Structure 1
Amino acid sequence: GFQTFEGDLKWHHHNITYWIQNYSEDLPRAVIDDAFARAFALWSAVTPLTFTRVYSRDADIVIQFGVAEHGDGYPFDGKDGLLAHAFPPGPGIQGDAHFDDDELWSLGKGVGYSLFLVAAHAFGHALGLDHSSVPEALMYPMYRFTEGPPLHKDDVNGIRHLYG
């Protein structure tokens, strides 16, 4: 399309802030907070970045649960199909991560989609990663549930090409 992003699509400071704008009712709020924290911890271990929760829209990464058209011109599609989407680093809408609340959000072993795995993937984009063509990689574009460690070489390779 004609929409273009600003900048080089990577962050240029080390303390990345995030704001949880709202919550799905599918899981306890503290459980959602923890799922997001664990997803960020995956990436903080392998980058020089830290992730700090803040409490206003003055944040690098704004996290939102939404249904159908939810404010950015890129509507969700109801149950299944698209699970979440995320924008690459930069100002404004860039950096942000949205989750489709027409999904049933669960954690490992739950009957729905893993919020942890989807967030880990979405946060990858919010740090600057593209989709991978490596089928086992976290950044492969299709959801799959695993109980094994989410990161693969291709994911780490990609993130280090951005941050060292």
Structure 2
Amino acid sequence: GDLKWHHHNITYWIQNYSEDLPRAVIDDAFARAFALWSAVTPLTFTRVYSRDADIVIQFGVAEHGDGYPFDGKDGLLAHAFPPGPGIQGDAHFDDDELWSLGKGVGYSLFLVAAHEFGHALGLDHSSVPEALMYPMYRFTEGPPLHKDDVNGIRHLYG
């Protein structure tokens, strides 16, 4: 089983943007979230400008083109597909949510992106509450990766 990427140079394309944050702040949150996973895998993550990228990132609302619609404010925050072709590996963010970074209102794009990118590398949800892959958003200033996350990603990639 174990869905995983079968190449090391993973490419990504930011297909569109939310207006909740500066373009540069969005780019960097995504870059940081990839940096998390880069460090503990044999994968590199390169930003490209191409619909052929492995991980296509999209901000969307309601039906946004994949038949899995978002649900307005609250409920779903984001979803991502495990490794593979096409829609597989892609990460979508619900722009009916308020996207932010600091403590306060809205959801940390960085933290939600780090969780989504976990899925996009092949991780399912964890049963360990403190875990990045635990299916509960919580804002933190602490290091996001937990042993269980690293255990999980090593299970796939070595």
TM bin (shorter chain): over 0.9
Kindly state the Cα deviation for residue 71 of structure 1 after the two structures are TM-superposed: 0.4
String of CA shifts for 1:126-161, please: whole Å, max 9, x gaps: 000000010000000111111111000000000000
1:20 matches 2:14 = yes
In the TM superposition, what whole-angstrom CA distance separates every residue of 1:8-66 from its partner, at most 9, and x where no partner exists?
A: 52001111000000000000000000000000000000001000000011100000000
C-alpha distance in structure 1 between counterparts of 2:67 and 2:133, whole Å: 24
| Alpha-carbon displacement from aligned partner over 1:72-112 (angstroms, at most 9, x marks no partner) | 01100111110000000001110000000001100022421
C-alpha separation between the residues in 2 aligned to 1:111 and 1:8? 36
**Structure 1 partner of 2:156:** 162
Q: Check the 8 A contact 2:2/2:156 in 1, yes or no.
A: no
Contact 2:126 2:148 in 1 (8 A): yes
TM-score (norm 2): 0.98
Number of residue-to-residue matches in the alignment = 158
TM-score relative to the length of structure 1:
0.94
Q: In structure 1, list runs of 5 or more residues that go unmatched.
A: 1-6
What RMSD in Å do the two structures reach over aligned CA positions?
Answer: 1.0
Percent of residue pairs identical = 99
- 2:97–2:107 CA contact under 8 A, matched in 1: yes
The structure 1 segments of at least 4 consecutive aligned residues displaced by more than 4 Å after TM superposition are none
Q: Which residue of 2 aligns with 1:135?
A: 129
Q: Is 1:144 matched with 2:126?
A: no
